[PDB]
Amino acid sequence: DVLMTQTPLSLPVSLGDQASISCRSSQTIVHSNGKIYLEWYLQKPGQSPKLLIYRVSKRFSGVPDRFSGSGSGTDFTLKISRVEAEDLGVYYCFQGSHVPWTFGGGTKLEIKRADAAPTVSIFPPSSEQLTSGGASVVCFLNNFYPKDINVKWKIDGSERQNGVLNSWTDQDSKDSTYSMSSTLTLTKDEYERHNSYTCEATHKTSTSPIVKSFNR
Amino acid sequence: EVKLVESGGGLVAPGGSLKLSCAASGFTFSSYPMSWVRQTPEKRLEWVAYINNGGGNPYYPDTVKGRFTISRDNAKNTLYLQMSSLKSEDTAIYYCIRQYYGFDYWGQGTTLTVSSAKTTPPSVYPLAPNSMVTLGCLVKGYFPEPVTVTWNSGSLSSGVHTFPAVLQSDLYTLSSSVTVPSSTWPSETVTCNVAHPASSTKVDKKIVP
């Protein structure tokens, strides 16, 4: 089959700056009719893929002028001339000259923005869950940049590592931030043997953790 | 307007069969060829079927040839994909596509999970605690993916983001966060609506203080 290999795997870029995404095929991709059917698709977080470019360089309707495709032989390129926050997502190349039709692996475009500190919220277990015998304590760390962040759970001032589950969002297209949730799962019996519950987020915006707590 | 709406996804045992549907509207269905593309959990895209405007030239990659069958009903404005002898590798989101220049218009997708496990609907728990307040929903212990989480049936769109589901002990868990003005809540009701199509389940949890 035709192998489509993309470069780079991830691409950080500032607003207004230029981005270049490379595609390399394992063989020439000229149809019997002499034309090259190389297509570019963009998948934004939470969305279906969308066509940007077909026939190497032809913009699909609606695609702004700043998207430009080029290439021949085995090397093809997508250029975004003035990246906007809405351009983030995963870009896929695709060859439609030979069967089976094949996609590249994808290149994630990440927006660079100013460092931003999270907005932390801690939540106690609901009574409905406590009746089922379990007890999850949840902490949202919302709308921060860059993506890397540390969360520490504390029960009566003592750190608690086991039973923690953390999950990061994709980058937000509106404000270019990330968010993440941390869920500490306990049994009902264990939760009620203690009173003070804390999550503290450490981020490169401060050597001081951001601390949020509750009791009971 | 061009809308494509896929249906029929869910959970299927290894070796089983399942047929997907796609409802086409907003254009002259009979004039355009159609394709199916699938996206695996590794988020790799794979083309799985093509059919021309009149229902002929059905084409497949060898990975699904002999097992998958694309078909169409130009009277009902519907596209079909019959699947059989399903393997683990077929688990994916399956997208219906109107094709012309390339894959011009994609549906939102429907999800096939090939697994011996059983369907488990989610338990949904409210998350309750300054001018601005953050609330949440805990969607715990469901299988398979996906679930869709909405707030006040769609009215609350801004201030919302949903965290990716994570698998632990053969069940998924995710959370959704929504932020509203302090004035908004609890003065007015805020509800979390969770849909789990594979179990045909809808849960409505109000967030009470």
């Binding site: 026939r55 069967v99 | 060829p33 030239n57 084409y59 094709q99 012309y100 220049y101």
Partner: peptide
């Protein structure tokens, strides 16, 4: 002309 040819 610009459409992707059939398989």
């Amino acid at each position: 002309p610009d459409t992707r040819p059939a398989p």
